[PDB]
Every structure is written in C-alpha cells, then in structure tokens.
Amino acid sequence: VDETGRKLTPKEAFRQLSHRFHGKGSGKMKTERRMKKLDEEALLKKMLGTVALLQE
C-alpha cells in the first residue's frame, strides 16, 4: 500500500522497491505525470443528454 492507503499494483510496488534499493527515484516529469494521473482518477471516480435535448 502507498502512504495514501491505496492498494498497490505489483509493478509499481517493485518500482518503489527498486527506487529504495538503488537510492534514486524517478524524474520530476514522471512524478508530475503520475500525480496528475492520480488526481485524474480521483476526479473521474468522485462523480450531455440534457444539452443534446435542448440543442435538438
């Protein structure tokens, strides 16, 4: 599990293990991409027919 408490897929679990093992993490761009993906998932999960009906 990650610090936020989400179940961790084995691939990124090993990613974190290897980071901690070697002693160097991912780049800034990759961190930003990962975080933006997490908040994208949060925004999608936390939730045009009327528009189409009105425009028809």
Binding site: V1, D2, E3, G5, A13, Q16, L17, R20, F21, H22, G23, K24
Partner: peptide
C-alpha cells in the same frame, strides 16, 4: 491497516558494508 514497506539500501551508500537498522 497497512504500512509502506521499509526496504534497505545496497548501492551508493557511503556506509559500512553491513546493513543499517
């Protein structure tokens, strides 16, 4: 509950050959 795994380091340590705690 669950906690993040606490792994040790091998490469680029500047420390003793043996592991820390």
């Amino acid at each position: 509950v669950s906690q993040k795994r606490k792994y040790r380091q091998y490469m680029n340590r500047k420390g003793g050959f043996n592991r820390p705690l």
